[PDB]
């Protein structure tokens, strides 16, 4: 029997990347096979399980989909092989061509590639288009619109990622960079949360926003335990009319509405969409069915730019995504690197975004009319990539992030001025190596 290349991804996209792997297996003509294996649903726990396999020298571990913040650590640990170790010498060129350069930077350490981007990510504003006329453009307007809805007994929750984990650090980073701040200096060696008056003011403003959302009159009473999934559910279940979340929320809403899970969008009652869910449960409609389902959603659901912190200042939205790394444990370097190239080829990218919701990194797709029609999020994604925020690249990232979320949470108890100083001190201890 053939070589088996393991391909670890978060369970959130197991269905999509199982499909991509199966396409690759057919394209590979039997020379080897790729098998998808699922990691946990939240970032911190995805890393822990990879770290366990790597530290335990799991020789069956071949390809791993890393979050865009683990590159420096995995490179320095020897866990992610440099692309230059590809026996075929093709990995570096494949990663570099027709690949968005912002995402590509997240796969680098010390000027060298240790992974090939496969998906990027940038959060959008999602809103109930039937309950307001235009969406909020700033966090002040988010709070005012939520208060209006709360006064009328409407869905008053703002759906955010507020629990003690990476998603809270992402929220903070976006608000911070949108206000003109940054966590670390460009070289990663100094803390810049409070080192100048303008940097301090950006940190305080970001903390003011998180605190205000957490203490808002109609706020989610479980906001201190919220993540991507609770935010998606809060809007689908009619408890929130305002949500910030990644682009996968659109196909999720259409799919669950067709299945009968969205009260205010009973697409299950529409006979023309029978069969839009395929044999394994994935929303995969005809072109006509997609248009009809998307158009119906527009009555009650829209997306817009992530809200900024001040008027006429577009948000700087934190980049997310996945970069494919070959694990140093692999017994089959040549096939692992070849698997990476197949998994991220242009037609697999097309499917990854249209079916999975995850933004492609292949630059060409954002100009492709067929892609634009079936992945309507593309234009706001592109707009937000032009001024994206990026979490710092540092080999102490996980340690720094754990301290930050432990300082930010519970978000109900943030004090903007004092938490700003505690955050700066906790980050300093992280880059100092205290751990
Ligand atoms: O597409 C949704 C993804 O949500 C998570 O990943 C995003 O959010 C993380 C923080 O919670 C970021 O660190 C990451 O960069 C983002 O891509 C989830 O972990 C992914 O599995 C989902 O695809």
Numbering used by the authors: 14 to 448
Article passage:
The Mtr LpqY-trehalose complex crystallized in space group P412121, and the structure was determined by exploiting the anomalous signal from iodide-soaked crystals. The model containing bound iodine ions was then used as a search model to solve the structure of a native, higher-resolution, data set by molecular replacement, and the final Mtr LpqY-trehalose complex structure was refined at a resolution of 1.7 Å to an Rwork of 16.9% and Rfree of 19.4%. Two Mtr LpqY protein molecules are present within the asymmetric unit. The Mtr LpqY-trehalose complex adopts a closed conformation, which is further stabilized through a central arginine residue within the hinge region (Arg404, loop 3) that forms interdomain hydrogen bonds with the carbonyl oxygen of Leu332 located on loop 2 and the carboxylate of Glu179 from domain 2 as well as being directly involved with substrate binding. In the Mtr LpqY structure, both of the glucose rings adopt a classical 4C1 chair conformation with almost equivalent dihedral angles across the glycosidic bonds (φH: 63.2°, ψH 65.4°), thus having rotational symmetry about the central glycosidic oxygen atom, mimicking the conformation of anhydrous trehalose crystallized in the absence of protein.
The Mycobacterium tuberculosis (Mtb) LpqY-SugABC ATP-binding cassette transporter is a recycling system that imports trehalose released during remodeling of the Mtb cell-envelope. Recent studies in mutant strains of Mtb have demonstrated that the LpqY-SugABC (Rv1235-Rv1238) ATP-binding cassette (ABC) transporter recognizes trehalose and enables the recovery and recycling of this liberated cell wall disaccharide that would otherwise be lost. The optimal conditions for the production of Mtb LpqY and mycobacterial LpqY homologs were explored extensively in Escherichia coli. The overall architecture of Mtr LpqY is typical of substrate-binding domains of ABC transporters, consisting of two globular α/β domains joined by a hinge region, which in this instance is formed from three flexible loops.
